[PDB]
Swiss-Prot record, chain A:
Residues 1-49 are annotated as: Disordered. Coiled coil: none annotated. Part of the 50S ribosomal subunit. Interacts weakly with proteins L18e, L24 and L37e. Has been cross-linked to L18e. Belongs to the universal ribosomal protein uL4 family. Residues 42-49 have a biased composition (Basic and acidic residues). One of the primary rRNA binding proteins, this protein initially binds near the 5'-end of the 23S rRNA. It is important during the early stages of 50S assembly. Makes multiple contacts with different domains of the 23S rRNA in the assembled 50S subunit. This is Large ribosomal subunit protein uL4.
Curated annotation (Swiss-Prot), chain B:
GO terms for biological process: cytoplasmic translation. Pfam families: Ribosomal_L22. GO terms for molecular function: rRNA binding; structural constituent of ribosome. Belongs to the universal ribosomal protein uL22 family. InterPro entries: Ribosomal_uL22 (IPR001063), Ribosomal_uL22_CS (IPR018260), Ribosomal_uL22_euk/arc (IPR005721), Ribosomal_uL22_sf (IPR036394). This protein binds specifically to 23S rRNA. It makes multiple contacts with different domains of the 23S rRNA in the assembled 50S subunit and ribosome. Coiled coil: none annotated. Keywords: Ribonucleoprotein, Ribosomal protein, RNA-binding, rRNA-binding. Gene3D superfamilies: Ribosomal protein L22/L17. GO terms for cellular component: cytosolic large ribosomal subunit. Signal peptide: none annotated. This is Large ribosomal subunit protein uL22. Part of the 50S ribosomal subunit. Contacts the macrolide antibiotic tylosin in the polypeptide exit tunnel. It comes from Haloarcula marismortui (strain ATCC 43049 / DSM 3752 / JCM 8966 / VKM B-1809).
Curated annotation (Swiss-Prot), chain C:
GO terms for cellular component: cytosolic large ribosomal subunit. This is Large ribosomal subunit protein uL13. It comes from Haloarcula marismortui (strain ATCC 43049 / DSM 3752 / JCM 8966 / VKM B-1809). Keywords: Ribonucleoprotein, Ribosomal protein, RNA-binding, rRNA-binding. It comes from the Archaea. InterPro entries: Ribosomal_uL13, Ribosomal_uL13_bac-type, Ribosomal_uL13_CS, Ribosomal_uL13_euk/arc, Ribosomal_uL13_sf. One of its GO terms (molecular function) is structural constituent of ribosome. PANTHER family: LARGE RIBOSOMAL SUBUNIT PROTEIN UL13, RIBOSOMAL PROTEIN L13. Part of the 50S ribosomal subunit. Interacts weakly with proteins L3 and L6. GO terms for biological process: negative regulation of translation; translation.
From Swiss-Prot, chain D:
It comes from the Archaea. This is Large ribosomal subunit protein eL32. GO terms for biological process: DNA repair; translation. Belongs to the eukaryotic ribosomal protein eL32 family. Part of the 50S ribosomal subunit. Interacts weakly with protein L15. The chain holds residues 96 to 237 of 241 of the full protein. GO terms for molecular function: DNA binding; nucleotide binding; rRNA binding; structural constituent of ribosome. Keywords: Ribonucleoprotein, Ribosomal protein, RNA-binding, rRNA-binding. One of its GO terms (cellular component) is cytosolic large ribosomal subunit. Residues 1-87 are annotated as: Disordered. Binds to the 23S rRNA. Residues 8-21 have a biased composition (Basic and acidic residues). It comes from Haloarcula marismortui (strain ATCC 43049 / DSM 3752 / JCM 8966 / VKM B-1809) (Halobacterium marismortui). Residues 38-64 have a biased composition (Basic residues).
Amino acid sequence: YAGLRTPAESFGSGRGQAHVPKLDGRARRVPQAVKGRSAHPPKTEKDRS
Amino acid sequence: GISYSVEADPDTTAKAMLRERQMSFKHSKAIAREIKGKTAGEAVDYLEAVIEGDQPVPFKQHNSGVGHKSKVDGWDAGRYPEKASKAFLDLLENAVGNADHQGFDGEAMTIKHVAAHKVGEQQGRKPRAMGRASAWNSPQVDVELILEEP
Amino acid sequence: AEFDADVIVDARDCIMGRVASQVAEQALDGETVAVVNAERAVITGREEQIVEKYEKRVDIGNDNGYFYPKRPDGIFKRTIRGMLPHKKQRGREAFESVRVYLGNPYDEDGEVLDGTSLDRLSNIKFVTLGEISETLGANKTW
Amino acid sequence: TELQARGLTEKTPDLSDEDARLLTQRHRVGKPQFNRQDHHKKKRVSTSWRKPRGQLSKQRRGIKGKGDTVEAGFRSPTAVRGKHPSGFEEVRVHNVDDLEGVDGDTEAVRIASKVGARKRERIEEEAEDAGIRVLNPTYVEV
RNA sequence: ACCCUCAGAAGGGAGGCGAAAUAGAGCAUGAAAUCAGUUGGCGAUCGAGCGACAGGGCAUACAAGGUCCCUCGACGAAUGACCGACGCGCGAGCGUCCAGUAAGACUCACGGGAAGCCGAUGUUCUGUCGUACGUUUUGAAAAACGAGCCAGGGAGUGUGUCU
RNA sequence: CGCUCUAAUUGGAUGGAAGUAGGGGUGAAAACUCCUAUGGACCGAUUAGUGACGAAAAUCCUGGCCAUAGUAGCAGCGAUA
RNA sequence: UGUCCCAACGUUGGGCCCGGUGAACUGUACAUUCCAGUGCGGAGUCUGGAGACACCCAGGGGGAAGCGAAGACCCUAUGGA
Ligand SMILES: [Cl-]
Ligand SMILES: [Cl-]
Ligand SMILES: [Cl-]
Ligand SMILES: [Cl-]
Ligand SMILES: [Cl-]
Ligand SMILES: [Cl-]
Ligand SMILES: [Cl-]
Ligand SMILES: [Mg+2]
Ligand SMILES: [Mg+2]
Ligand SMILES: [Mg+2]
Ligand SMILES: [Mg+2]
Ligand SMILES: [Mg+2]
Ligand SMILES: [Mg+2]
Ligand SMILES: [Mg+2]
Ligand SMILES: [Mg+2]
Ligand SMILES: [Mg+2]
Ligand SMILES: [Mg+2]
Ligand SMILES: [Mg+2]
Ligand SMILES: [Mg+2]
Ligand SMILES: [Mg+2]
Ligand SMILES: [Mg+2]
Ligand SMILES: [Mg+2]
Ligand code: NA
Ligand code: NA
Ligand code: NA
Ligand code: NA
Ligand code: NA
Ligand code: NA
Ligand code: NA
Ligand code: NA
Ligand code: NA
Ligand code: NA
Ligand code: NA
Ligand code: NA
Ligand code: NA
Ligand code: NA
Ligand code: NA
Ligand code: NA
């Protein structure tokens, strides 16, 4: 859940802002956002044997 | 904060500085540029006239909207930064003071180097229409002065 | 006043453009030239049309401007500028080291460049720069 | 009283006539800078070469004036590739034992920057006695 | 610490500690954007993808590059004459011979020279070419779309099955 | 070509590592390297591995910063002080 | 009856200069342009010419298909309500 712990949402078009999910006016969740999730992260599930 | 950007021979040099002064960094530029090369004593006289409004400071870089002044020479726009000029009297008052305490003839010392540097802003916020707020800051100026024997 | 022309050319009864062409070619080779008797230079053609062109040039213009000479003086010089890259350094140099005069202020008599002369005996359809200027409204100061 | 670099600073390698000619060719011809397109229009774009990918790229399209595109054809002569401008073939050296096997005629040595002054001194003296040149030598006041 | 200055527990100067205060309090290092002062180049008659490649001016401590300039001579691919002799053409001019000669890029040797001198770097001038970049598109400099600038962040990963 | 950490082999560093600034040399190039200064403790090479491994862009995210500009506002209200 | 012919003068607060305070919109880059032409057919940047010494103050806004809003109209989606 790292980076997914929030209800952030995108205002969409209309304020000259990029469609990025935001909360309290701070972008969140998405990979390109500081504090966002890690696109493709290390995984426990992977077989390293 | 700044450090002297120039080398100064201690046997023939007097130093001084102002720290985090909340004044016009833009006027400082002008004032510094203006008084450079002058004599600490001629410098004080000048600034005191500027404060009196009988002498104007050439505003050569930061001049948008500035009205012309017949007394400026070789240029056209100029004003009378009294606040910034008073801060400069304190600087000079300090340097002529350190000058004397060292045995030199303060007033009669040339202004070898004098430079203002914007060291930051005291941040402020101004409410605006539509429930929005915006910057409303103050610049903090540092200024180095190096007197030198003629 | 005083112009050390390595070459002085007489334009009288000479085809303006053919003179201008050579005068350019020389000035670009570093030659200081002076054109004499501009008012007596000639350009072939049906006078009426010829004047319509030049007259159109005087009338052209706007705030930015289109300054076109009326004196046979400038006429010739502007004709020559058109043959030089006058906005480059080289060209402006070559154009500046050239000068056109009304009549002849020198003592020497100008030379006549080869192939620029017009035989008035076998020619009737042509015009004098001066004639052109009088029509444009210039002040016959010659 | 003056600085003097240690070792055989003046040493030159001995090359066959072909290598020497091929070396002079590389030095004469040279090569384009090969800097990343438009690296000079934006500070965030550094000089490091990157292949223009723009479908409309003026460089990628080979429009004269927009820079050379890295190609094999630009390589330097097999026989001289990698040689110092002097003619020597460099050898990276980290200690005294690295000096073993080095032909002081064909090769010169370059002491890695990490190596300290103490170890440098030893490397520099034994290199000289082996007839090898130190490309980056120490300047001592003599 | 002490002393001078100052309205002053502010600040500044001098001074002290320490290997270092450019380690002096949000105090290791201290990039880019960017700001002050200043140095080099350009500069108040001149034109705009900001450059690439050539070639000139001016500027440059060492170091890590050491070349480069002129006489002559050797070698000399393709290309390749002038003049003069003779013969043609109304003529511009051509043919034969002189001659595949003289010449001919690079490279080299002897002699002489340069150390801001050669390279290189900074800036500027000249020539040639040149209306960003990425994307949308049949067609983009585009009056199509994106970015004020910089730094850091920012997009083929895991399990199972199949081939 | 370059990055992280692992392993084997093998090196450098307070007689000054990394990083940073400016500068010299190599490579067609990704990049490698050296010099000077700053810095003051870590840093590599080869081979085999490893992967939240390479940015100029997404009205991209966060921070910082410049022009805008010493510019607009600090007048307008039946309460003009 | 200043709505108009048809505009005038005056009053007060701004505007303009000075001290102090001090934002924001906007910004790919370059930029002194004009007339034509050309080009994805609506160009400050291409091409040809013309004009153009540099800086600054005020103005009214002709142009930047000016700024502001991923077009509400129209069509398309095996979209939504
Ligand atoms: Cl400011
Ligand atoms: Cl006009
Ligand atoms: Cl021109
Ligand atoms: Cl006739
Ligand atoms: Cl290859
Ligand atoms: Cl050769
Ligand atoms: Cl992939
Ligand atoms: Mg996170
Ligand atoms: Mg004004
Ligand atoms: Mg509110
Ligand atoms: Mg750049
Ligand atoms: Mg620090
Ligand atoms: Mg279309
Ligand atoms: Mg990054
Ligand atoms: Mg090994
Ligand atoms: Mg890309
Ligand atoms: Mg304004
Ligand atoms: Mg009242
Ligand atoms: Mg033009
Ligand atoms: Mg839409
Ligand atoms: Mg509808
Ligand atoms: Mg429905
Ligand atoms: Na939360
Ligand atoms: Na697992
Ligand atoms: Na200005
Ligand atoms: Na005056
Ligand atoms: Na004046
Ligand atoms: Na004619
Ligand atoms: Na006209
Ligand atoms: Na140069
Ligand atoms: Na697109
Ligand atoms: Na494009
Ligand atoms: Na267009
Ligand atoms: Na902004
Ligand atoms: Na990635
Ligand atoms: Na935005
Ligand atoms: Na009225
Ligand atoms: Na307008």
